[PDB]
Design a binder for this molecule. Structure first.
Ligand SMILES: Cc1cc2nc3c(=O)[nH]c(=O)nc-3n(C[C@H](O)[C@H](O)[C@H](O)COP(=O)(O)O)c2cc1C
Ligand code: SF4
Ligand code: SF4
Ligand code: SF4
Ligand code: FES
Ligand code: FES
Ligand SMILES: [K+]
Lengths: 45, 214, 432, 263
């Protein structure tokens, strides 16, 4: 707790797997607000 | 080389087996919801990279699958695959070594790092080792400019390397261990080597210097 | 009295207080350094008040162009026409020499997440797509963890900070391209197409990502917005000269004793920045040959000009160069200046998008010519020809990559023509 | 009305809002150079051959994609406009191959004519050129892609007019190549039209290969009878022999296209 400025606190990324980013993106799906609608399924529709 | 025209081969053809694992379909489902409805073509890049993290490279069949599930024309996924350089359209080694050789890294003797790897692995730039464990290619600036010379092996940056240091990393990878990312010089990050010259004071706590109105 | 000498910034004025990552970077470690403080109060002040603080603070774009940030963000302050509105944070740090944006998303991600909210509310945006370069996988994972904390803490999402404002932060990873740092080419990547820039008009404020209004902003130019609003725009205008105010992150690299990323006040003398923070030039300040002040797209300046030039937008423009991303690349006498600039042209050849003729066919033309200048396999009459070729590329292209490839050549010819000619005289006699 | 006033070399002209600088010059009989712009395709703005100076502006504007603002004086023949056309034409011809004698587009080539009308008269290019490998896209269109100038007219036409998303650009930079990437045939009822809209000899007719030259043909304006649409055509003949069929513009029937059977 005492002010310490001699250690690297960003060590969590030493054990990130290949799917870490996509796993986090999957967890941030129930918080997202509903997307806007263009009105068509795609520009080719 | 890396030609930008596809020719069918027994090991790379539209009938080559590829399909997303059941878990990846869930990840793809979350990817598509990050974009407005009716603009599902915006998921080509993240989905293409996902198809590469499962396989390790993008066969012509993998590109067709990405087109199939996003309802995008196949030619519009070939454009993405060939434009962005992180997509591997041929098999690579288990550890894709990428040496930065742009001027900031060149000025700090990045050629010595490249020389050390070739002698150590017994390969040349752009070649895969006989055991299919290492692929070596030069790349442009990777961001870790102040920590030059540096290399990227898969998804990790190894920085402040010297000809001795990089060879240690290859030995650790050729045994099975997981080398620790970051600089190998004594420092931890972009901080100056000879001790900090700034931010050497307890940072001010919440609500310091706030304006009167706020 | 307005200050005449600038620099010697104090640790109480540095916005990025965890630049070196020595402290905790999670939500608990950020709320102790002033992040997410009175965010709801700032949001309820409205967009005009937020844009008023940024406008009066003198903040200018930190991505390299340097446009006034307050005026640019104001183009989005217009009534809705039925389309969504988005903020796109450009984290596609790919300018050779620049590492500042990497140290913000890896050690101060919450200072960026809050900036998206503060900047987005000022623009009336409903989401903030953060385009992070593909190679920054570990930094993009930290930013995803920080965003998850903000959602769980109620700081973003629905009813952000308890302010009644809906906001989302999305992180989209690039697939590897320097051109995807350009504002219009970054939009095309988010839309799933090739990273080929667009013509303007239409500007992103009118037609942008998904065809909706958009404002592309740099990581640093968005991460300082919350601190400007909290401490006011008057405080941010205290530093630097007139129209060059603020604090800037500097990446000193190349032939220096202690390459580092350090925050410093704008208008700090270049000779003071290199010696105070980076341990001086290798072999002493008298061993300096040239410095590229603003990355790689900015022309190099020789030692005879670095002894007095200031590190701000207007001071460097007066010296026939630019501030760019404030990435200082130092070269000493041992350096081969022609081979060091030729490799930069080779970088632009590889990173050219190939869309438009002058840079598709001209950047690869300059690369061939510069390749022979390295060996001296040319004649002096080609130096003037290379100048005209660069002037034909510059200003005739869709994006500013073409200009960024011409400027390095012009600086070399402007300040090192005797080196080129001498290299040619040596080649002739040797092959005789 | 809502018409706004712009000047083309000092001559006033009233144009509707949304009009482009290139279209404003048409109203006064002036035709801006072009390789990528086609009046019936999407605006690309990537050949940079239409750059035109705007008075009191330091930067040249893409005349094909720049909407005209009120009170603009478009300078179509200034030194800046003419020096922009020489540089762009010089970059187009840097890697172009010396194929004119053996190229079916010789004599009716926009790159030849705009090189002799708006470009320089010599080259200062002292390097080796690029060479691209040819591609097979059917029995009708012969491809020699070393001559391609990356104008993307075939890409836009195939996607917009023909509704076939088979063509595209692979790679990036100087090595950017137009093609189908995979071995595929662009067999469409409107496939022959990519021959015409290709300003260079990169796309040419295979049946017509090497048989004639443009100057020696006689043009007979006739009607197509392969269907009931009545497409207007030009029957090119030489010494009493039919050589090729070409579209003849008719806004109300067939635009400037014809089907493969007609062609
Ligand atoms: C070739 C090229 C690459 C660029 N790369 C970046 C980048 O990596 N990060 C960034 O913030 N701006 C970059 N820019 C500048 C952007 O186009 C744009 O000016 C900036 O992102 C807008 O944000 P700002 O107001 O902070 O300047 C680049 C421009 C060009 C022409
Ligand atoms: S200048 Fe180069 S990178 Fe920029 S749009 Fe034109 S071709 Fe693409
Ligand atoms: S396309 Fe035109 S310039 Fe090129 S070889 Fe054919 S006729 Fe000559
Ligand atoms: S093949 Fe012809 S039409 Fe297609 S891009 Fe090349 S020059 Fe243009
Ligand atoms: S030049 Fe190698 S990290 Fe920037
Ligand atoms: S005709 Fe305008 S850029 Fe091609
Ligand atoms: K043609």
């Amino acid at each position: 707790e005492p002010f310490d400025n001699t250690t690297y606190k960003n060590l969590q990324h030493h054990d990130y797997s290949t799917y870490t980013f996509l796993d986090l993106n999957l967890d941030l799906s129930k918080f997202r607000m509903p997307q806007p609608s263009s009105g068509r399924e795609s520009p080719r529709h | 080389g890396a030609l930008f025209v596809h020719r069918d081969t027994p090991e790379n053809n539209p009938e080559t087996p590829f399909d997303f694992t059941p878990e990846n379909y869930k990840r793809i489902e979350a990817i598509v919801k990050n974009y407005p409805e009716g603009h599902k073509a915006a998921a080509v890049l993240p989905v293409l990279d996902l198809a590469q993290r499962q396989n390790g490279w993008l066969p012509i069949s993998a590109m067709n699958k990405v087109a199939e599930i996003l309802q995008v024309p196949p030619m519009r996924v070939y454009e993405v695959a060939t434009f962005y350089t992180m997509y591997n359209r041929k098999p690579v080694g288990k550890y894709h070594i990428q040496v930065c050789t742009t001027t900031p890294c060149m000025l700090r003797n990045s050629d010595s790092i490249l020389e050390a790897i070739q002698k150590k692995l017994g390969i040349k730039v752009g070649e895969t080792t006989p055991d299919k464990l290492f692929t070596l290619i030069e790349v442009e600036c990777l961001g870790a400019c102040v920590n030059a010379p540096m290399v990227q092996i898969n998804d990790n940056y190894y920085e402040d390397l010297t000809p001795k240091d990089i060879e240690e990393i290859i030995d650790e990878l050729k045994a099975g261990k997981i080398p620790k990312p970051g600089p190998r010089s004594g420092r931890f990050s972009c901080e100056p080597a000879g001790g900090l010259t700034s931010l050497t004071e307890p940072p001010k706590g919440p609500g310091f210097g706030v304006q009167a109105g706020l | 009295p307005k200050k005449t000498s600038f620099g010697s910034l104090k640790d109480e004025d540095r916005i990025f207080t965890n630049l070196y990552g020595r402290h905790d970077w999670r939500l608990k470690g950020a709320q102790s350094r002033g992040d997410w403080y009175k965010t709801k109060e700032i949001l309820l002040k409205g967009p005009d008040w937020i844009l008023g603080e940024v406008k009066t603070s003198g903040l200018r774009g930190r991505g390299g162009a340097g446009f006034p940030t307050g005026l640019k963000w104001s183009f989005m302050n217009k009534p809705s026409d039925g389309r969504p509105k988005y903020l796109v944070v450009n984290a596609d740090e790919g300018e050779p020499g620049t590492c500042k944006d990497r140290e913000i998303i890896r050690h101060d991600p919450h200072k960026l997440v809050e900036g998206c909210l503060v900047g987005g509310r000022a623009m009336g945006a409903r989401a903030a797509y953060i385009y992070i370069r593909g190679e920054f996988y570990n930094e993009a994972s930290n930013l995803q963890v920080a965003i998850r904390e903000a959602y769980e803490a109620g700081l973003i999402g629905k009813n952000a900070c308890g302010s009644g404002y809906d906001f989302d932060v999305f992180v989209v990873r690039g697939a590897g391209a320097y051109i995807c740092g350009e504002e219009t080419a970054l939009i095309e990547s988010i839309e799933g197409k090739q990273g080929k820039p667009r013509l303007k008009p239409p500007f992103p404020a009118d037609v942008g990502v998904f065809g909706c209004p958009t404002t592309v902003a740099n990581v640093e130019t968005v991460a300082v917005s919350p601190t400007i609003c909290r401490r006011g725009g008057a405080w941010f205008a205290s530093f630097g000269r007139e129209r060059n105010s603020g604090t800037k992150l500097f990446n000193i690299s190349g032939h220096v004793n202690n390459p580092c990323t350090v925050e410093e006040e704008m208008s700090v003398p270049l000779k003071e920045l290199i010696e105070k923070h980076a341990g001086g030039v290798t072999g002493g300040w008298d061993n300096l040959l040239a410095v590229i002040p603003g990355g790689s797209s900015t022309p190099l300046i020789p030692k005879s000009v670095c002894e007095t030039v200031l590190m701000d937008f207007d001071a460097l423009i007066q010296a026939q160069t630019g501030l760019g991303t404030a990435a200082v690349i130092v070269m000493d006498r041992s350096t081969d200046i022609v081979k060091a600039i030729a490799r930069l042209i080779e970088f632009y050849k590889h990173e050219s998008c190939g869309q438009c003729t002058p840079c598709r066919e001209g950047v690869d033309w300059m690369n061939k010519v510069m390749a022979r200048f390295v060996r001296g396999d040319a004649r002096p009459a080609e130096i003037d020809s290379l100048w005209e070729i660069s002037k034909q590329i510059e200003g005739h292209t869709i994006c500013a990559l073409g200009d960024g490839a011409a400027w390095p050549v012009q600086g070399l010819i402007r300040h090192f023509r005797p080196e080129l000619e001498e290299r040619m005289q040596q080649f002739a006699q040797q092959h005789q | 009305s809502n018409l706004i006033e712009v000047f083309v070399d000092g001559q006033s002209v009233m144009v509707e809002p949304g009009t482009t600088v290139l279209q404003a010059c048409e109203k006064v009989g002036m035709q801006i150079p072009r390789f990528c712009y086609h009046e019936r395709l999407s605006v690309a703005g990537n050949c940079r051959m239409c750059l035109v100076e705007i008075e009191k502006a330091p930067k040249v504007v893409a005349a094909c994609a720049m909407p005209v603002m009120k009170g603009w004086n478009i300078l179509t023949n200034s030194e800046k406009t003419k020096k922009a056309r020489e540089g762009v034409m010089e970059f187009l011809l840097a890697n172009h191959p010396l194929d004119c004698p053996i190229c079916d587009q010789g004599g009716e080539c926009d790159l030849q004519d705009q090189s002799m009308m708006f470009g320089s008269d010599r080259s200062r290019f002292l390097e080796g050129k690029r060479a691209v490998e040819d591609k097979n896209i059917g029995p009708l269109v012969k491809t020699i892609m070393t001559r391609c100038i990356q104008c993307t007219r075939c890409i836009r036409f195939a996607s917009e007019i023909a509704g076939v998303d088979d063509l595209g650009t692979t790679g990036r930079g100087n090595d950017m190549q137009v093609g189908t990437y995979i071995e595929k045939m662009f067999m469409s009822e409107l496939s022959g039209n990519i021959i015409d809209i290709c300003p260079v000899g990169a796309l040419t007719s295979k049946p017509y290969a090497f048989t004639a030259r443009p100057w020696e043909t006689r043009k007979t304006e006739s009607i197509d009878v392969m269907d009931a649409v009545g497409s207007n055509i030009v029957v090119s003949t030489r010494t009493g022999e039919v050589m090729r069929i070409l579209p003849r513009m008719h806004e109300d029937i067939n635009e400037e296209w014809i089907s493969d059977k007609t062609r």
